[PDB]
Write a protein that binds this ligand. Sequence first.
Ligand SMILES: Nc1nc2c(ncn2[C@@H]2O[C@H](COP(=O)(O)OP(=O)(O)OP(=O)(O)O)[C@@H](O)[C@H]2O)c(=O)[nH]1
Ligand SMILES: [Mg+2]
Lengths: 360, 682, 49, 49, 103
Amino acid sequence: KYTTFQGSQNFRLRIVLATLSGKPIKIEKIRSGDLNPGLKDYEVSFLRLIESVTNGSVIEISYTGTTVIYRPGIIVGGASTHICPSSKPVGYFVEPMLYLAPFSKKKFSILFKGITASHNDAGIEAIKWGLMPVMEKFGVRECALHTLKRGSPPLGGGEVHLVVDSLIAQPITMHEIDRPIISSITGVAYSTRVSPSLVNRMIDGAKKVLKNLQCEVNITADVWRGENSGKSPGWGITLVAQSKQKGWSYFAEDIGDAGSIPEELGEKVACQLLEEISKSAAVGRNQLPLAIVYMVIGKEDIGRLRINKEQIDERFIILLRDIKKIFNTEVFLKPVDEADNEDMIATIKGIGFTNTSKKI
Amino acid sequence: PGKMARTMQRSSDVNERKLHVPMVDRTPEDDPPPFIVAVVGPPGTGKTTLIRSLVRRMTKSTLNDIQGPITVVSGKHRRLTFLECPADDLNAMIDIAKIADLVLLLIDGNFGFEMETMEFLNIAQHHGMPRVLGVATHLDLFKSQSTLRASKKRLKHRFWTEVYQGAKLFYLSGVINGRYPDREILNLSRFISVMKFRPLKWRNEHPYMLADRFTDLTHPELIETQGLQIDRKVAIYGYLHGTPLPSAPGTRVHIAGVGDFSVAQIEKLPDPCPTPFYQQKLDDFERLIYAPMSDVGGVLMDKDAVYIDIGNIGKLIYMDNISPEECIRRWRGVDLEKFVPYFDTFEKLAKKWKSVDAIKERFLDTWYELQKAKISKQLEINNIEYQEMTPEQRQRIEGFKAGSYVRIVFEKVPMEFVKNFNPKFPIVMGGLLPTEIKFGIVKARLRRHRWHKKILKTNDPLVLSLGWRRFQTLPIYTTTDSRTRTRMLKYTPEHTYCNAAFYGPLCSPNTPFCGVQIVANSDTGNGFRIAATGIVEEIDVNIEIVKKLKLVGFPYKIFKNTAFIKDMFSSAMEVARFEGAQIKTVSGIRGEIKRALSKPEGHYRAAFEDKILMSDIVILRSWYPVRVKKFYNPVTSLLLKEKTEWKGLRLTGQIRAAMNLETPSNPDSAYHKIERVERHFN
Amino acid sequence: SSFEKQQIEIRKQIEQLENEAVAEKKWSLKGEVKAKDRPEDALLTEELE
Amino acid sequence: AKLVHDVQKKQHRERSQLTSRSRYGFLEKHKDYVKRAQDFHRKQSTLKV
Amino acid sequence: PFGGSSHAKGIVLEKLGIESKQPNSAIRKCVRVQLIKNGKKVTAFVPNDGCLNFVDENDEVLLAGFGRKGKAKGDIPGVRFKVVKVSGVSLLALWKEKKEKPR
RNA sequence: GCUACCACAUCCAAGGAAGGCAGCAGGCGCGCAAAUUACCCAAUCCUAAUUCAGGGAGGUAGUGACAAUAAAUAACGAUACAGGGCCCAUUCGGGUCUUGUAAUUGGAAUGAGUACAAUGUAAAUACCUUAACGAGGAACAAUUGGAGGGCAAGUCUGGUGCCAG
Ligand SMILES: Nc1nc2c(ncn2[C@@H]2O[C@H](COP(=O)(O)OP(=O)(O)OP(=O)(O)O)[C@@H](O)[C@H]2O)c(=O)[nH]1
Ligand SMILES: [Mg+2]
């Protein structure tokens, strides 16, 4: 009701920031100049999910559907089941719970049903191997994601199980100012109701692109035989590069189109991974907002993270503007001394935040 | 040999005495604030004369008419803010207990250890014990030195039961000339000048201040046209302790005993009582007391009259007008729902990534001291990245760190406050969190205090100090039936802990709080006033909470193993709601209710495990949910004019007495004495 | 004044809670409930485990 | 004893027969019932024999 | 036992078996403390579940050895420390209502 | 004490100017813990130009369950009413006897204490003396541990009814 936003910009991020702050927000003029002007089904179902995991949180949707009033409550959590609508996958319905999970009154055991792959949002293996290590660095210990059945577009029938146990008081502030030596490159190519020949063709194209390096490279094959395969057939590949010493990881992933060549898919994913590593600095460009908001809610202390000038872009700017508007916090940015690159140390005074919802 | 072994054991024991629990200091090493010293005692023990003698020695200034907080300098690096608390105002005592860091506890000598001294000891011990220091006055009245030394030793040992043993207390002899003996005052002042303090959690997590100077800012013609009822814009001057107060306008602070405000404007001002080393460095880079509310020199300011004695990518980002595309255009020369980032086309990426050299470049003793070293490392990294940028960081992102004069102007402040404010009482400002601005019901655990006589009743008001606020609520005292339910009680137990749940503003778990009963000086009497103490355990917006009612019926036709019970319900529709259920008797035998009857309306048949008798009573245990009343009432004592005898909700016994009723009673529930006969069977 | 208004409504609530705490207790918030004490069919109106 | 107060060793008293059932005298507790069942089972045992 | 001394300081970390049903039992009188000399966690009794309600969390207790004489029916073989002091004050004084717990 | 050279360090009108004891008491050395910045040179001596001045040398008090010695918190009756009290055994059981009571009641004795006082002392404090008051349980209200029981229209758990924990 008090902090006012415009447009359909950063819906789940704004909801998460409202919940973590406690400041009541109102998002107005949502998709005004359209022919079905208002909200979306995945948007209203995400609001249903937020109301299901919190307590005493008042959400009201205008009859025009272009103005949402959110007044946030406390974070109960628990064990639940969300049947996501088919327009968006469970990666999109999971990532805000990755923001909100370990700061709750109870542990998180949620069972998501729907599609588990898209070109837009996060795949399950991507979200595991890519976003879990950032949280395990920031200091949550027992977190995991099981895959009971794995869907595929446009039919899905996939079930994932998010389980997060460690309820920490606040994330420990991080001091990463270096550029991690990448140890190895691993990956995984999965397939629902198509052939092991297609799986091996994907991994062969990937290794053919990555053959020009020296580090160890290993991609596993994951065919899904039987009842845990969903309805529609499809395939996809996910690649990660691990720095074993500090335990960092960068990643890129994609799926197979309706009539594309698996070798070309492997080439595209390998080149996207190498481009992300070239445009990376101690984080991924898709991991960045997670680590930024965690350093913001870390305790009352300067936290330091080495990011890249290329990693500064439009979305970084709009994220920092949203953070400045909600938490009243600024990111100081000092350039690193070394002149072969133009890395910037980001120092954020993590504001005083505590997991005040827990029971003792 | 033996000497080596015995000194090994002794050294081991003293090391394991010296270990501790790591806490974060949060105090400025550079320019620390004045330590706050608070004089507490009964209303006759000479604390004005003590504060006058201490100021006169500390700064060589005779200082009549002490009122309001008063900061003086001491040593090369210390300043002391002396503050007198009144002894008629339990709210003032509670505020002092939360804010103070050294407590000068002055107690009478001819008369021993009054209740106000004991009360302040216990409320400070609950809200976190600051460094306390006893002095004992009135020692001239003792006739014989045997009586004098006996009294000295008895007060000393009761005090050592209260505080750590060996807490030294200073004996002041006579009030000869509006002051005390200079020898004992020198010893006292040297001790409080070399006092050493310890880290406390509430201070080291919250930003707070004690307001020195006070003024309101409204137009006289605005007052004239609106008619004196208008909320007045008020400025507040003082120091800053504890935690960096954020420099952005729009925050929520509690002025204790007034209300709950966002600040309107904040302005850093340089201290009028500066440290000697501060002034040394000030004069070096260029090439005494401060007491607004009281007298100083020979001049005192009134409301308006006077009385005098006769004689850059970062700022491009955080600019809000510019489109981000224009910002990145300037720095060089979309949404986030697409979690995949933007990329380059496939053939361009492959053509660029024929080569791998540009990325082959990047490719391949005591644990207490360890933890305290980690804290120190983080503190020094804090320090150097603070030192990196002066006009941006320490002005804005670091807030206004402790030890800086600040002026803060507010809105919506009450006319009652501005009019009836008299400067003998303190005004504390604590910086709340969003967790302490929200509301819900809190679950604490608490006992009745050990020196309070009467036990506390469920759904009966209780004023309590929790956080900065001092609000009156209706708690509900519950137990958990061996960790199964949350059944409510009707009283608190007399010598142990019971859970409690009550409406009110929320505070962090593990927070100690302390509740009193009646707080009027016109209602004190002679009993101890502190009522309950405990810790708030958890927060919620809704708890389930249960009261047990047992439906009672009597048998009227018994058989072998089967009876017709008659009086529990009213209708066969009711019994059909309740059928198949589990009943027992007073006599202990179990059974179930099995079927409704038809010709009488509320009768049923039940099967038991032995032949029930006619004399007995069947019962059905049932769990009805109760709900917590939503009464919330802050004190606002210094908004009130008299500032004592704040009277809110009365207690149940006093309500019955004032309305001339009598206590309810059940004569079929009062116990009797039973003498049963030895029974013989055929 | 605004403080005067606020204390007026709080005084009203004070009077209400005083009358409630002195008045008679609800049949369900007794113990040992009998059919001659509760209202008729109130046990079907209500909900208890 | 060991680590038990007297208020912890309180001695709870016992309730008597409800007043409206003074005809059906002396509400029977567990001790009286166990006397009854003991004697009934003795009689039944000798009858079975 | 824990090395040199007779008594060992430690931080209360968690409260084992608070969720048990039957009051005044072994798993209800047990807590878990981490010794500060080693940073090493180990489990330890308190007497009297009331005194369990005294000791809370992150609270600087001081343990001593337990010293059982003969085996009991329901006691846990293996816990070897009891709590003597809690944050400077002694649990027996807190229990007998002589002193208070300062923070 | 003086003169150099090293090191901290004070004041200013900016030219200049001055500086250093764990002896006695009192502190800091951790964020967690301990005797008074008292009295006197009256004794013991010492220093002087010397009977007389001086002396934190030494003496006098204050502080405290480190240790060490002595010993209070009661004694003597008079009733009244009851019939059971105690000891041994692995078992049946055996052995012995004016005992048991929060039941009534009488006068005597006294110091912890508070002090007229005097003594003690450089002046005091304490001790040793003694007028005046000062004992019936809430008075003048001693502790610290250890071994047992059973009580509810109480709660929890297991079970082959009414049981077991
Ligand atoms: N005989 C004697 N009188 C004292 C002593 N100390 C204080 N007084 C008396 O107490 C009065 C001083 O009162 P305050 O010190 O102001 O008492 P306060 O509680 O601090 O403040 P007020 O309650 O406002 O007096 C003077 O009139 C003194 O005569 C003492 O040691 N001996
Ligand atoms: Mg005064």
